[PDB]
Amino acid sequence: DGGICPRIGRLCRRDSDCPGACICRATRFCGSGY
Amino acid sequence: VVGGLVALRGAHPYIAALYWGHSFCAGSLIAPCWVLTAAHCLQDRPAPEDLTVVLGQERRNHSCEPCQTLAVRSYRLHEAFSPVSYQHDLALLRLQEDADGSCALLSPYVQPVCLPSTTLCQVAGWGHQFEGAEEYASFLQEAQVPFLSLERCSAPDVHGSSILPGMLCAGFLEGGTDACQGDSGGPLVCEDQAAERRLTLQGIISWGSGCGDRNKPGVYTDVAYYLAWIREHT
C-alpha cells in the first residue's frame, strides 16, 4: 500500500514489531507492505 | 543491497556494523570514537549496553583478525526525529574509550570517512540482496547509484510529498540497484569523477518502498545538510 518502510534488519512475528509502514513479511523479517 | 557486487577488502574501512537483540544496522565511522547511523535503527531506544559495534568487517557477523569489537557508551538521536515521516533520520554513537581516550585502532581496515565540505556514488551494506529476501548478505555488497534531483524524486508516482528537507534520493527510476532492509545506517559515499581526489560521505541509508523497484529509488539522509549538527554533537 506504499508508504515509508525503513531499511532496518529486524526479526518479527507481528506487524507491530516493525517501524513505519513496514509489515512482518512471510520471511519473519520487516519489509515493505502492500 | 540489490544489484551490487562483492566489496573489495580494502574499499570500505569506514563501515560499521551494529548488532543488538534481533536487529541489524550499519553505520559510518566519522571519528575514532564516533559512528554516524540512522535514528530509526534506535527507534525503540535500546540500552547502550545492549549495542555491539564492530569495525573492519568484510563478512557479516564474522570475527576476523583485523576486526575490532567495541561497546557503545551513549548515543544521541537528532531531535524532532519522527517515526512517522522519518525527517531528521540520523543518530550519533559514542564508542567506549580507554584511559588514553582511544576507541577504534585505526588500521588499513578501520579508517574514518571524510564528511562533506560529474559525481559518482556507491552504496554498501550487508542487507537483503533482493526485496523480501530471507537472509542477509554474508559478503559486504557495493553498488554504484547516481544522484536523483529533488523534483524527479518528488514526482507523484515516485515518492511524492514524502521527500522532506534533509533527505536525498539516489538510484535509477527503472530499478535494479538499491539499498534494502538491513542496509539502514550504512554509507552512501561519493567521489568526483572528473578528479577522483576524495571519498566523502554524502548519505545515510534510510528508507524506501520495496527495494530496487521501478519508480521507487532509495531515500537517504543528506549528510551535508546536517553537517553543523554532526560537528556540534561530536
From Swiss-Prot, chain B:
Q: According to the UniProt record, what happens if one changes residue 210 to R? A: In FA12D; CRM-positive phenotype
Domain of life the protein comes from: Eukaryota
Effect of mutating residue 45 to Q: In FA12D; CRM-negative phenotype
- Mutating residue 126 to C: effect? In FA12D; CRM-negative phenotype; transcribed and synthesized at wild-type levels; not secreted
Question: Which residues of this chain are annotated as glycosylation sites?
Answer: 61
Q: Where is the active site?
A: 40 (charge relay system), 89 (charge relay system), 184 (charge relay system)
Quote the annotated effect of residue 68 to K. Answer: In FA12D; CRM-negative phenotype; accumulation in the cell; low secretion
**Domain Peptidase S1: residue ranges:** 1-234
- Give me the disulphide-bonded residues: 25-41, 33-103, 64-67, 121-190, 153-169, 180-211
Outcome of swapping residue 39 to T: In FA12D; Shizuoka; CRM-negative phenotype; transcribed and synthesized at wild-type levels; not secreted
Q: What is the effect of changing residue 42 to M?
A: In FA12D; CRM-negative phenotype
| Mutagenesis or variant effect for residue 211 to S | In FA12D; Washington D.C.; inactive
Q: What is this protein called?
A: Coagulation factor XIIa light chain
Give the organism the record lists.
Homo sapiens
Question: Could you say which residues of the full protein are shown?
Answer: 373 to 613 of 615
